[PDB]
Amino acid sequence: LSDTCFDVGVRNFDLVPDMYDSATGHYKSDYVANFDRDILPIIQRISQYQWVSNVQSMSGFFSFQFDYRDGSAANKANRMKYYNYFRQLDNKV
Amino acid sequence: THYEWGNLPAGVSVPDQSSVSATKNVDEKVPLPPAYYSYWWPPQSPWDVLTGELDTEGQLHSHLPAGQQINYARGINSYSQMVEHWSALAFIRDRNQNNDGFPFFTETERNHELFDFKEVLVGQVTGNSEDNETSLPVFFINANKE
Amino acid sequence: PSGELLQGSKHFESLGTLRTDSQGRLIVLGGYGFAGGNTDLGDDWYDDISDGSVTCVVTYSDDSSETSTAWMVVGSPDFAPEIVNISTLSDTCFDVGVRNFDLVPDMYDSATGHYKSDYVANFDRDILPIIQRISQYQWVSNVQSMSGFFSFQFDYRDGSAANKANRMKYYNYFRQLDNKVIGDYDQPQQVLMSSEVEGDILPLMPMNSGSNSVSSSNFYDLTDNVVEKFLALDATQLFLLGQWAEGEFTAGPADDYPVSDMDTASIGNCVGLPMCPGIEMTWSLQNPVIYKDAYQIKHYQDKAYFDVNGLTPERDECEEETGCEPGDLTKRMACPWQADFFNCTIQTVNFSEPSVNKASQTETVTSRTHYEWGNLPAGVSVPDQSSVSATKNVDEKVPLPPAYYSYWWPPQSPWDVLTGELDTEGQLHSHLPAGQQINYARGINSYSQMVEHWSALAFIRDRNQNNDGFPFFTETERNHELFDFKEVLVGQVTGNSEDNETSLPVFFINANKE
Amino acid sequence: THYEWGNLPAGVSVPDQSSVSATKNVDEKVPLPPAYYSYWWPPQSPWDVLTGELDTEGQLHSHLPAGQQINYARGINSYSQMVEHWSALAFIRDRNQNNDGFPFFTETERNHELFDFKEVLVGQVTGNSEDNETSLPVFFINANKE
Numbered sequence: 065l066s067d068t069c070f071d072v073g074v075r076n077f078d079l080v081p082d083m084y085d086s087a088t089g090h091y092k093s094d095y096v097a098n099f100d101r102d103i104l105p106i107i108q109r110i111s112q113y114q115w116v117s118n119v120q121s122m123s124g125f126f127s128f129q130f131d132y133r134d135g136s137a138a139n140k141a142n143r144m145k146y147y148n149y150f151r152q153l154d155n156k157v
Numbered sequence: 158t159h160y161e162w163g164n165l166p167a168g169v170s171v172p173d174q175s176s177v178s179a180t181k182n183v184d185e186k187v188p189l190p191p192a193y194y195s196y197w198w199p200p201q202s203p204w205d206v207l208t209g210e211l212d213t214e215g216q217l218h219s220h221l222p223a224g225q226q227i228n229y230a231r232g233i234n235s236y237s238q239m240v241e242h243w244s245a246l247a248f249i250r251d252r253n254q255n256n257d258g259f260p261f262f263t264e265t266e267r268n269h270e271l272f273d274f275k276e277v278l279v280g281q282v283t284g285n286s287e288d289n290e291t292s293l294p295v296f297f298i299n300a301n302k303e
Numbered sequence: 304p305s306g307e308l309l310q311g312s313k314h315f316e317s318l319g320t321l322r323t324d325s326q327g328r329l330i331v332l333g334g335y336g337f338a339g340g341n342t343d344l345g346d347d348w349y350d351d352i353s354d355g356s357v358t359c360v361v362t363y364s365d366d367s368s369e370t371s372t373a374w375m376v377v378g379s380p381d382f383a384p385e386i387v388n389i390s391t392l393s394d395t396c397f398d399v400g401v402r403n404f405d406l407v408p409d410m411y412d413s414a415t416g417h418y419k420s421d422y423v424a425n426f427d428r429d430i431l432p433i434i435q436r437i438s439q440y441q442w443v444s445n446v447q448s449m450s451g452f453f454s455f456q457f458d459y460r461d462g463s464a465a466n467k468a469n470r471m472k473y474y475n476y477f478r479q480l481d482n483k484v485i486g487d488y489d490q491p492q493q494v495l496m497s498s499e500v501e502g503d504i505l506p507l508m509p510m511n512s513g514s515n516s517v518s519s520s521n522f523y524d525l526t527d528n529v530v531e532k533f534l535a536l537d538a539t540q541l542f543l544l545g546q547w548a549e550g551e552f553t554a555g556p557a558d559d560y561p562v563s564d565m566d567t568a569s570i571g572n573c574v575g576l577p578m579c580p581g582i583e584m585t586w587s588l589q590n591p592v593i594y595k596d597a598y599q600i601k602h603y604q605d606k607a608y609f610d611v612n613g614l615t616p617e618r619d620e621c622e623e624e625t626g627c628e629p630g631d632l633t634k635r636m637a638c639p640w641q642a643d644f645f646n647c648t649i650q651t652v653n654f655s656e657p658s659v660n661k662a663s664q665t666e667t668v669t670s671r672t673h674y675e676w677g678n679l680p681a682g683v684s685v686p687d688q689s690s691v692s693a694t695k696n697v698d699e700k701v702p703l704p705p706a707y708y709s710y711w712w713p714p715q716s717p718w719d720v721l722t723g724e725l726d727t728e729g730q731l732h733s734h735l736p737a738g739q740q741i742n743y744a745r746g747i748n749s750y751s752q753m754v755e756h757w758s759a760l761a762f763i764r765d766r767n768q769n770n771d772g773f774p775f776f777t778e779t780e781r782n783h784e785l786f787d788f789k790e791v792l793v794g795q796v797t798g799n800s801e802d803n804e805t806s807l808p809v810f811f812i813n814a815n816k817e
Numbered sequence: 818t819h820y821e822w823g824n825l826p827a828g829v830s831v832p833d834q835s836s837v838s839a840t841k842n843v844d845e846k847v848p849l850p851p852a853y854y855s856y857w858w859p860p861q862s863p864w865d866v867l868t869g870e871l872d873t874e875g876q877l878h879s880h881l882p883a884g885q886q887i888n889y890a891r892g893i894n895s896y897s898q899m900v901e902h903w904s905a906l907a908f909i910r911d912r913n914q915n916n917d918g919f920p921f922f923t924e925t926e927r928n929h930e931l932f933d934f935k936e937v938l939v940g941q942v943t944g945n946s947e948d949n950e951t952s953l954p955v956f957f958i959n960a961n962k963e
């Protein structure tokens with residue numbers, strides 16, 4: 065629910081002006097994320113759904129078969145494969 | 158159903174018998190196949206958990222040895238049983254809390270004394286005594302227990 | 304086994320087929336799944352399994368010969384060929400080779416009987432495979448306690464002194480190997496947990512049953528029957544994990560051992576540990592007395608000796624150090640093999656008494672039924688009634704509580720698998736939607752049902768094979784049409800109609816179905 | 818319940834384990850024992866009757882041989898079921914009416930097709946494969962039937 069209140073805050077309350085442009089209604093593609101603060105928690109959360117459910121298909125997203133920290137252009141294809149397995153959000157129509 | 162008699166003596170002929178039966182089941186709200194077994198909120202409402210009783214006493218009241226994956230809500234067989242017995246449910250916590258990066262989450266503080274146990278042999282269901290080599294566990298709450 | 308068999312398979316015709324390709328390469332194809340006997344279910348019983356000598360004579364243009372040899376082993380189906388056993392049979396043959404055949408002289412000193420602490424291990428070649436194997440036991444078992452050993456919560460590649468404590472914590476969770484002494488039980492392989500202190504609890508690694516979680520010290524009219532409760536890696540695997548813990552390792556390429564890629568390709572797909580007996584082979588493969596060199600079986604006698612006299616039945620290739628006779632590598636396994644496959648599931652291991660696996664249990668149930676009548680009219684008194692009942696159940700071989708739910712060989716015999724039927728047709732014949740974890744052997748309710756229906760079992764394989772690091776293993780090719788289904792409501796068991804809100808699935812094989 | 822482990826090796830021993838549980842059933846309007854099994858209006862409401870199907874097509878749909886004492890309302894298991902399917906019950910008729918003083922009353926005109934059957938092996942109730950040599954007759958009405 066903190067992710068909810070935070071998401072609401074970004075797209076509607078200028079919480080982070082470097083991440084979102086309220087005039088364009090769009091996010092800012094020049095925003096530099098940080099692994100440990102923005103990315104690692106998600107990888108950590110997925111990894112703990114196992115003790116309470118059988119969600120083995122989620123395994124390959126916290127196995128570090130490739131370096132998740134490595135942001136070099138050589139590693140882009142791996143990070144793109146990982147990312148394009150995530151579902152995009154639906155339009156509210 | 159088709160009936161036919163054989164091993165009858167020379168000269169003896171018995172006419173076969175035939176009968177047609179029918180059953181029709183209608184359901185209004187049913188998931189449409191192909192279906193996928195999907196979870197709701199595993200952190201807030203567990204469903205696939207480990208056995209955490211480590212001593213003898215607890216293994217006799219729980220009827221399961223430690224470290225086996227079994228249904229979180231086993232024993233509560235109805236919505237009204239959950240309205241009344243929700244607090245007899247286990248807390249899922251790390252038994253290795255003091256060692257980072259080495260978690261071991263099990264069931265802890267489950268009210269084992271409320272649930273009765275019944276080991277149902279497969280034959281009791283199939284009528285075949287061979288199937289009695291295998292059994293399945295049935296947990297339930299007896300309202301007449303005190 | 305001549306004639307006709309009263310039970311199971313009726314006629315024995317062959318042990319398999321020998322072929323050559325377009326280039327004259329040998330192809331050894333084994334048994335068809337024959338299993339029959341003359342006793343109910345087992346004395347007069349037999350199977351299709353085999354093993355033996357491979358002899359090659361390449362004659363040249365100048366009419367001069369060159370004779371070379373090898374071994375052949377036939378096994379029961381590998382139902383998840385992609386999932387690897389933490390310790391394979393190649394790991395066994397390799398470990399034997401290090402400690403007994405100088406395979407790697409930089410790693411072991413045969414004069415001191417000890418390993419060499421100055422050996423520099425390599426992450427990718429010695430360490431990463433173990434981390435990769437542990438990570439795949441999930442698709443076939445529920446071994447979540449093993450998770451923290453492939454989570455990369457810390458950098459496994461980092462060998463800097465700052466990272467030593469983390470690598471030492473990881474390493475000291477692994478079980479050390481037991482001494483091969485006859486009556487010494489209080490050892491590390493009889494130890495399940497890391498501690499008994501709440502907040503410091505975790506099953507020691509590898510979390511699997513050992514080579515004897517079944518019989519106790521006092522079984523078979525003995526007082527010192529050998530016990531080995533829980534699993535450990537082999538000597539060579541744990542040693543290299545020791546070198547990594549220490550930081551005596553590298554990142555980047557490393558040269559392969561003096562072993563062929565072809566030699567590991569075979570036995571690498573066989574169970575190394577545990578051996579009770581195991582799936583393809585047993586603890587004869589651990590004895591160096593069987594080998595002439597690392598990975599190379601010693602051959603006892605010649606073709607002429609066998610043409611004249613046949614095989615030696617009473618002979619132990621472990622006692623007499625002179626080599627193997629055809630059929631020696633498989634003779635210790637069950638007859639028929641379906642027994643070993645039937646018991647390759649899970650063990651319920653005692654973890655309080657080092658020398659006990661099973662004991663006799665005695666349950667006494669003493670009840671008092673009490674009857675009392677009320678709402679009776681003024682003046683009317685009815686005497687209460689009381690009766691005492693008793694029940695006494697005695698069992699001879701029962702695991703001693705506290706018990707731990709332990710696995711046998713998850714890669715070779717699956718037990719906790721996912722539903723893989725993706726279309727409607729298949730979801731109606733299977734009666735389960737996709738992606739649900741359910742028992743691998745559901746439907747087969749007896750040892751004799753497994754003797755007859757073992758080939759109706761599913762193959763566990765990656766549905767995402769084309770995308771590395773993104774596996775998705777499910778059931779595939781399960782003979783769904785054989786199994787009937789029955790949704791049993793809880794009330795049918797408890798007599799309480801409320802419990803009928805919940806049900807449980809019952810799968811079985813009807814012999815009258817055709 | 819009391820547990821006791823044995824066949825343990827020399828010097829080895831484990832503590833006994835024992836538990837005490839209880840059940841309490843309170844039933845409001847129950848007849849007082851000792852009681853006598855007493856009929857109401859046998860000629861207007863038959864209870865213990867004889868099956869009178871003389872051919873194969875009759876015995877297959879009835880599942881019973883002729884001349885057997887069984888319950889008149891076998892298959893009617895509910896008060897609601899009686900309100901729905903009363904007219905399915907037999908008429909007990911003298912089958913030797915022509916002859917005088919030689920009567921032979923049996924069931925006639927039963928709607929056998931409405932009723933489904935199931936032979937329950939005793940061992941399916943007890944868990945004991947050995948009781949399967951004996952089976953219990955169970956008649957019921959299935960609404961899914963067409």
Ligand code: NA
Nearest residue numbers: 197198199202
């Ligand atoms: Na859930």
Ligand code: NA
Nearest residue numbers: 199200201202
């Ligand atoms: Na939570």
Ligand code: NA
Nearest residue numbers: 648711712713
């Ligand atoms: Na297994």
Ligand code: NA
Nearest residue numbers: 383386714715
């Ligand atoms: Na395998």
Ligand code: NA
Nearest residue numbers: 857858859862
């Ligand atoms: Na009456």
